[PDB]
Each structure stands twice: as C-alpha cells, then as structure tokens.
Design a protein around this ligand. Sequence first.
Ligand SMILES: Nc1nc(=O)c2nc(CNc3ccc(C(=O)N[C@@H](CCC(=O)O)C(=O)O)cc3)cnc2[nH]1
Ligand SMILES: [Ca+2]
Ligand SMILES: [Cl-]
Ligand SMILES: [Cl-]
Ligand SMILES: [Cl-]
Length: 159
Amino acid sequence: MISLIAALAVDRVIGMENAMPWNLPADLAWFKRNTLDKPVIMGRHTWESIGRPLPGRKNIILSSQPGTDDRVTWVKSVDEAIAACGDVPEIMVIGGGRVYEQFLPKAQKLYLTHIDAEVEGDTHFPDYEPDDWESVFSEFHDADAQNSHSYCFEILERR
Ligand SMILES: Nc1nc(=O)c2nc(CNc3ccc(C(=O)N[C@@H](CCC(=O)O)C(=O)O)cc3)cnc2[nH]1
Ligand SMILES: [Ca+2]
Ligand SMILES: [Cl-]
Ligand SMILES: [Cl-]
Ligand SMILES: [Cl-]
C-alpha cells in the first residue's frame, strides 16, 4: 500500500518560497511516528529542505538528474521508486507537490496535518475530494509553548 503524509496550511499550502513560517515539533514527531521503519519517497526540493537523510528509514529520491549524495537511493521514475521499496506493507510518500500529484492516484491512505496558518503558497497539496475519503482518526491541538500554531492530525482511507 502507498500512503501520503503531508502538512497542509489553509488552502492546502504545503510549500513556500522559503521555509514554512511555523515551529511545530509535535507535527514533526507525528511525521516520525508514521514514517519510522518505512521507506520514504521524496522529490529533490524536499530532500534539500530536510538537509540530511531521515534516520531509521530507507530514503528514496525521485529525480531526473543524477544523484549528489551516496547515503540515499536515487531513482528516475515512479515505477523505479516503488521497486526500490521492495516488499513492504506500506510505502510513505513525503512530497513535495509534484511527487504528491504523481502518487495520489496510487495511494490508499493519507496522513494529513491541518495547520491553522494563512500563508501564500508556492506549492499545494493535490485537490483531493473529501467525499471520496474516510477519516478514521482526527486529533486537534492548540498552539502551545513549543508549537506556534494550532494543528489537527488526520488519517484518511480511500473509500
Ligand atoms: N506531517 C508532516 N509534517 C511535515 O513537516 C512534513 N514535512 C515534509 C517535508 N519536510 C520535512 C522536514 C523535516 C523533517 C524532519 O526533520 N523530521 C524528523 C523529525 C524532526 C526532528 O527530530 O527534529 C524525523 O526524524 O522524522 C521531515 C520532513 C513531508 N511531510 C510532512 N508531513
Ligand atoms: Ca470517521
Ligand atoms: Cl505523534
Ligand atoms: Cl520536492
Ligand atoms: Cl469522513
């Protein structure tokens, strides 16, 4: 099964010209909880944003240009990315925009963090149809001493 995991500001904003203007360690802990010991597929801009390989996960970079880091796996097609995951119960697609757009039709599950932030977006999560998805988990949190915005965790399963 292929799953997508993303953090969405209002209007499904996922990326901006520069780093996103929030500080959400609790969302990064949720990201880690749901990706640990699973292969993760990402695009090159997300790879640069993270800075280093994500620990405890097989890091696969989908890109048309050859790779510039030996600590991860570089693939050039969606099918090569999936084959590089081997035989695993769940593949995690972690963005960004174009990578979400390519993997959404194959995905059966979405892990979404909805962030109460009004920002002008550079890239957006795909306009999925909520009629077509079933929320099986939702958990709301206010901003606090460590987290700058209110956020809601959601898991959605393809109806
Ligand atoms: N829910 C969600 N939130 C995100 O911030 C997110 N970010 C990306 C792309 N960007 C990033 C940026 C940083 C890290 C990261 O550093 N994660 C660490 C935990 C952070 C920490 O320990 O300080 C990890 O080990 O997973 C992951 C993805 C893709 N899907 C997401 N999904
Ligand atoms: Ca429900
Ligand atoms: Cl968590
Ligand atoms: Cl990307
Ligand atoms: Cl629902």
